[PDB]
Design a protein around this ligand. Structure first.
Ligand SMILES: [Mg+2]
Ligand SMILES: [Mn+2]
Ligand SMILES: [Zn+2]
Ligand SMILES: [Zn+2]
Ligand SMILES: [Zn+2]
Length: 601
């Protein structure tokens, strides 16, 4: 176990000051905060823990208020004595998910500096796919130590206690162990993170500096109009009713809009071909093939889609508005994706349909406050530009260089015809090839996206590789080093380990080869986006203009800018994004604005 003998519980100023003195001369120190809620903006700090050396850690309770809780240093007195140390950029701190801790302190007017090491990110940069990067998983992987779980001291279910309700000593065991373990994890991982300059570079200049900027974006939140979302909800109810009637009217009787049950009994029973369509799906959608002529499958297609969107965003979004700020605070995850891109939840901004009309209405609900406007800064087809650079292809490089539409430029080369005459179908064919290459799509998978026969798709890809030889080379070379060293890297050095590259399993090894071609372009896009965020945030902090960075979704950064400042600010965001990141890839940033996210998008 871990008893009350392990760590000290600081209940007096004199002892706290003794520790602050030791903390001041430590080379690095682990630090952690305890609160009464996972919600950063409204959580209250219940206590703090520190670790100066493996096995030497302490817990300082400041707001435990259960019946008869012992005297504790007051939250205000503890923070004023600790403030200088916390705000000192020279005092280096180590922590697990420091983004959270930085925010809690910000609730009390404290600016946490010296945010040097985050064990979550150390683990993530070492090997993004090694497993989960949370402390409990980390302590077990690297230290063969099983940590005290929050459930162990607080309980489970609705009757679960909040930190302020837990006994001082019990809270101490948990909090001081976090600090201690975090320091031990750093001592084991930091030395390893130096065996390679690639990962070390990404960790030091991309991931760590991004920690406080993610905190600031999350805490800023985004303005959502609940009325608009409600109208959209009422209207969708009516549209779902109408659509259901249109389905019944086309055939007979009533039925659910569920395939492999009520649909096959209608659809193919009235002429068609037996198999159904899985909601596997992004490759063989039987329902949308029939949709080009057959009416029923087209209405069932649209019905399901609207049903999904209503319960996911229309009904959910209004419930996420924080009472304290009046805004929605999404959760960004910095150590979850395999390629290094940021993910998002509650809400998952990336699942809002882009090329769909309803998704546009969801976006219209993201509004700018009075006298402000929503500004969108996007990296135009960054992955494609990255592939152009990685393949060193003069053809692609020149297309982007002279500002031509790469999809029409590619079609003009593949099909051999003037750029002005390329048709929509030809452009659509080249476009499917271009994005297919990024995901390492098979010549048959391209046929399923283009609806053309196999070997006809193969005919296009051979014509493509002949016109753009540099792309085949990159593809072959990347699969090469992937087998030679078990991993692939981005331009900045970020690595994706591929354990199934020599799998001996067929499909399992195919996946690893696709990931081999894909990761370098996706990871590089990710690195670029993170560098722009740090650069834009740095300008924001230094110059203090009337602008907030509110979102990050796909390849765009969304802001709130004062209406009278839009022009100067747009010039600035634009320069920072395509000139203060990587100077090797030919980058283009498209900046737009409006009353809501949809207008600026
Ligand atoms: Mg191309
Ligand atoms: Mn913590
Ligand atoms: Zn903790
Ligand atoms: Zn993208
Ligand atoms: Zn420019």
């Amino acid at each position: 176990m871990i008893s009350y003998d392990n760590y000290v519980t600081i209940l007096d100023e004199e002892t706290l000051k003794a520790w602050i003195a030791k903390l001041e001369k430590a080379p690095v120190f682990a630090f952690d905060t305890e609160t009464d809620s996972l919600d950063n903006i409204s959580a209250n700090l219940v206590g703090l823990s520190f670790a100066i050396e493996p096995g030497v850690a302490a817990y300082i309770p400041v707001a435990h208020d259960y019946l008869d809780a012992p005297d504790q240093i007051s939250r205000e007195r503890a923070l004023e004595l600790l403030k200088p140390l916390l705000e000192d950029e020279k005092a280096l701190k180590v922590g697990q998910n420091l983004k959270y801790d930085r925010g809690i302190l910000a609730n009390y007017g404290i600016e946490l500096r010296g945010i040097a090491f985050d064990t979550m990110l150390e683990s993530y940069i070492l090997n993004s796919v090694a497993g989960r990067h949370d402390m409990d998983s980390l302590a077990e992987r690297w230290l063969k130590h099983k940590t005290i779980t929050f459930e162990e001291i607080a309980g489970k279910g609705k009757n679960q206690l909040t930190f302020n309700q837990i006994a001082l000593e019990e809270a101490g065991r948990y909090a001081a162990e976090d600090a201690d373990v975090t320091l031990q994890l750093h001592l084991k991982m930091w030395p390893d993170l130096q065996k390679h300059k690639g990962p070390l570079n990404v960790f030091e200049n991309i991931e760590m500096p991004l920690v406080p900027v993610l905190s600031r974006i999350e805490r800023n939140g985004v303005k959502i109009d609940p009325k608009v979302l409600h109208n959209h909800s009422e209207e969708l109810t009516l549209r779902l009713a109408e659509l259901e009637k249109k389905a019944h009217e086309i055939a007979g009787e009533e039925f659910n809009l569920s395939s492999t049950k009520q649909l096959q009994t209608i659809l193919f029973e009235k002429q068609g071909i037996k198999p159904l369509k899985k909601t596997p799906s992004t490759s063989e959608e039987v329902l949308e093939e029939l949709a080009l002529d057959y009416p029923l499958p087209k209405v069932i297609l649209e019905y399901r889609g609207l049903a999904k969107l209503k319960s996911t965003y229309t009904d959910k979004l209004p419930l996420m508005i924080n009472p304290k700020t009046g805004r929605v605070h999404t959760s960004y995850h910095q150590a979850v994706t395999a390629t290094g891109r940021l993910s998002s939840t509650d809400p998952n901004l990336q699942n809002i349909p882009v090329r769909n009309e309803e998704g546009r209405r969801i976006r219209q609900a993201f509004i700018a406050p009075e006298d402000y406007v929503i500004v969108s800064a996007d990296y135009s087809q960054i992955e494609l530009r990255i592939m152009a650079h990685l393949s060193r292809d003069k053809g692609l490089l020149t297309a982007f260089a002279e500002g031509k539409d790469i999809h029409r430029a590619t079609a003009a080369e593949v099909f051999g015809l003037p750029l002005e005459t390329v048709t929509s179908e030809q452009r659509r064919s080249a476009k499917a090839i271009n994005f297919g290459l990024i995901y390492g799509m098979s010549a048959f998978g391209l046929a399923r996206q283009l609806n053309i026969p196999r070997k006809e798709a193969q005919k296009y890809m051979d014509l493509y590789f002949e016109r753009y030889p540099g792309v085949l080379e990159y593809m072959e070379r990347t699969r090469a080093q992937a087998k030679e060293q078990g991993y692939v890297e981005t331009l900045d050095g970020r690595r994706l380990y591929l354990p199934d590259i020599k799998s001996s399993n067929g499909a399992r090894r195919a996946a690893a080869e696709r990931a081999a071609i894909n990761a370098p372009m996706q990871g590089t896009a990710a690195d670029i986006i993170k560098r722009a965020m740090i650069a834009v945030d740095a300008w924001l902090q230094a110059e203090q203009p009337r602008v907030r960075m509110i979102m990050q979704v796909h390849d765009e950064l969304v802001f709130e800018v004062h209406k009278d400042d839009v022009d100067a600010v747009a010039k600035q965001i634009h320069q920072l994004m395509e000139n203060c990141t990587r100077l090797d890839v030919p980058l283009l940033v498209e900046v737009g604005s409006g009353e809501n996210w949809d207008q600026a998008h």
